[model samples]
Target: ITGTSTVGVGRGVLGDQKNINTTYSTYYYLQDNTRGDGIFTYDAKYRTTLPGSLWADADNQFFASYDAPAVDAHYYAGVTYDYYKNVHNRLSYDGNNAAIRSSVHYSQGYNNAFWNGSEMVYGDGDGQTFIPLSGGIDVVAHELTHAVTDYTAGLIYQNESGAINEAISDIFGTLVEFYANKNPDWEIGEDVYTPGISGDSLRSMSDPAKYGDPDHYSKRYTGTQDNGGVHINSGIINKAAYLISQGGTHYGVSVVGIGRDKLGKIFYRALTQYLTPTSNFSQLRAAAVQSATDLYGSTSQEVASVKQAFDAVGVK
Candidate 1:
């Protein structure tokens, strides 16, 4: 809605205090006009109906208990938007300054979040497996990255391509976390995954095998479940991305770390320039190597590290 931009202070799901962009007409609305046209957040009110009413507060303050998820969703979306613009030089997910939108408190005991091709939706979690998922910056970034992939690579959401889609989200999600430097780690959803557990996550890029996810191509799941194991088989690519950022030895293969910035550059180039909807693991390796070569040189350490990282994960 049309309103004047304002700022609101609130505590997130994890009790971290931060300021969120809001809009003010009669009541304060969770609409940020500071980034790319606007970023809007909504309250789902624990119902299935999507993108519920625009979150409103009488005062330009949102520290109430019920406002926690909205706060994090709004703030994190801005952070993710900033990451793309400042680091990647890209606009919003569509690369055209498209409005970023999110809905929080979706359904009671809902334990997941996703990008339904257009906007982001978050569940309030069952509290056992998760809390409000927006609390995790990586999780929010992960879902938003899906939109980026959709607009760029258009990787089909099945089979090897689907796994690549999932891995791309995980990869950039980790990068965004590190970009924010908020207790960042190579773990996905660790911050809001389980309230009763510590040091555990929905998935692990550093050690995908720790969560029974494949760290190598040979271990790829060929079953029909989970869209041909998109989430399950993503571990293979995730491990390669992790190895590219942090050198490691796996299954008698070794990789030289080229660091995260280079890792992100190469992958972003591949996603934007080289990858196709049908690209597979081997094709992804070529894309990364070519991306590294384009950014660095054919004989540069970045190219060598890209090849070594893929080989380490058996992508070759």
Candidate 2:
């Protein structure tokens, strides 16, 4: 629809009021023309189709309960885009200002979200496990980072490489969360996971072992399930990332904290330059070390901390 730039006020699935970009023509549409290329949102209306219908509103007001997910999805996508561009100096997921697209309310009683190798797809959870997946900024960033990974490392989604891919998402997702400073923590999906159950999350980067996930290489899952335990084994790398950002000791190995900014720089450099599709945990350690060395000096504390963090996690 032909439209002029406008703004809408809406409450997110988490009941937070925020302003969103819209287009005003015959109707108000959830399309942000201010950002790079554009950021578009759609309503799936409980279906599995891709990019359902572009969200349309009557008066550019979106406070209705039904509009919550779309609001968050659209707003969070903008935040993720800004994070990549402003913090990492990248244009977008492809580093070229690609149009950001998202679909909300995908399938009734669904409980997940993904990048779908193209666009973002969100599910309104079963209300017990979650409310709406887009309600969580970390979840949104996590899914979008998958696209970034696809364009850069193109990490194959299985076995060790797959675990690296998942870890990268979790790492950047947490960084984006902290960058936004909305109840920042090292936990993934804590904001939207288990509304009825407090102090719980879908995954934990600070202490992956807290949720029965392996925090050490020796304990990694060797099975074929879950894409060779892509999500499961990612905890090991996640713990390493957490330790790098916030110094800690594991199994008697100590790491000096390099802080989140350096952590992001090192990892982003590795993801964009040093990593390959088949890189494993050992290779990841090397890449991170090299990335840190490049960003800081070869003998800088940043590079040493990266090595210590990987060693603390038993990644070798």
Candidate 3:
């Protein structure tokens, strides 16, 4: 379920909007005295800080300004922070009030964004092909959701577990974009790049075939790169979740129209409530089916539809 859009973490904390694009900034410690504490205040600046790196070169020209990237990253982090809180009733990645630390301008011309378990990192895109990773709210949420997955399922980064991990992030990432109402077109990275390139969006949710290079879940897919091609093969599970949520034809219409929210709840419940360290696609399917049964009865149409969607994706 989508949550309220108004709530935010407020200014003056670490990575708040007011300090974005500004350097040599400092903030008060939010926590009380602890054993290893020596200073009453904390300096927000770090050795990793780079000049004009967030927006442009040191001279600050011919590139996007740091202000926009900083503001966008901070704003969306707060939004994502609230999203899991209100909708899923989760406080943070671990259901504890964990601090979300993020770094922008991670490296010059770096095109990837990732969460390294401790903080979210972003790169200023190379002017030629991509834009800043922080430009999109979903990107930040997607990276952070990986941390959430790490904390919960710790899905192994190989085989089906890896695919599910990637797919789960994509699913929630797209939903975060949807929740923000940023671009209602239902495509990834649309806000981060120039519209001229036909290959701008990183992934397509509504119609994976429109990308036109390969089937989403082809058996011939290879994992030469990208951590066993977790990102590549993720298209399969991502499409499966999208179809299940949107309710469409799958395997001779064995699965009919299931509510989007119902499907999301089932998946969420399965991930956070029932899934374990060794859970795979088959286990995930069973968990969702069981969740549906628990929520509605054994004879519920919702259960049948959820299972049908699962089976349509080759999960029994």
| Per-model TM-score versus the true fold | 0.99, 0.99, 0.77
**Model 3: which residue pairs collide?**
55-66
Runs off by more than 4 Å, candidate 3: 1-64, 212-224
Candidate 1: give the clashing pairs: none
Each model's lDDT comes to 0.93, 0.94, 0.62
Write the residue-wise lDDT of candidate 3 on 68-178 in tens digits.
455566556767777787778887787776756666666677777787767777776776556767777778788988988898878887766787887788778877777
Selected candidate, larger lDDT, 2 vs 3: 2
Could you give candidate 1's per-residue lDDT for residues 221-306 as a string of tens digits? 99999999999999999999998989989888888898999999999999999999999999999999899988998989899888
| Candidate 1 local lDDT, residue 171 | 96
Cα deviation of 78, candidate 1, in Å:
0.3
> Which portions of model 2 miss their true places by more than 4 Å?
none
TM-score of 1: 0.99
Task: Write the residue-wise lDDT of candidate 2 on 85-156 in tens digits.
Answer: 999999889998999999999999999999997899999999898889999999999999999999999999
